[PDB]
Amino acid sequence: EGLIDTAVKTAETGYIQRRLIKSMESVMVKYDATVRNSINQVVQLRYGE
Amino acid sequence: EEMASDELKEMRKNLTKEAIREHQMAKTGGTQTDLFTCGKCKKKNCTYTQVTTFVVCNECGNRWKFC
């Protein structure tokens, strides 16, 4: 049971991480001290509020 | 319900009490003790569980663990 659980986790978590990374790959903190994305859309006026 | 006989009223009350009791949920088990001070309420009542020892607050309900 434990081995099967580990095998399925090793197969599912990778896809989960991939989807999480491909959705916030362009977000960054610009020099205006604010977090935006590639479309220059402000997501947070300050990183982590 | 009010017009029912004494025996019928008692039976209905017993059934209602049994249903009310059965509707409840079993309390989480654990070893209750006052040796751990909960940081969320300042009280000493709480329950622990060894597995790492998880600490569950009794009154405040502070949840923590000690390794």
Binding site: E1 | R21, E22, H23, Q24, M25, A26, G29, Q50, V51, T52, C67
Partner: protein
């Protein structure tokens, strides 16, 4: 050699308790616990009894170790291991649950 006696006594007590629970369930005395059916509450009581017995055996084993013991040193240091590992190695493994 005394911890073995305590562990055997605890295991026998747990076996007697679970047998008594089974007898009560057979003769229709164990009333259903709130929020669960008869089989569910029976299984929950059995599991709680077994877990209490395992914890008692593990605690008895832990309190019967010596400062020179290596398992205890590695567990308290936290480098590699845990108390449950010592409990399974010496006192008793426990329940082999699935799903």
């Amino acid at each position: 050699s005394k911890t073995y006696q305590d562990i055997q006594n605890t295991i026998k007590k747990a076996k007697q308790d679970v047998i008594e629970v089974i007898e009560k369930a057979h003769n229709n005395e164990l009333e259903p616990t709130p929020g669960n059916t008869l089989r569910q509450t029976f299984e929950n009581q059995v599991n709680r009894i077994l877990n209490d017995a395992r914890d008692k055996t593990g605690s008895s084993a832990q309190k019967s170790l010596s400062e020179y013991n290596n398992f205890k040193s590695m567990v308290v240091s936290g480098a590699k291991g845990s108390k449950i590992n010592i409990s399974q190695v010496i006192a008793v493994v426990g329940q082999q649950n699935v799903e």
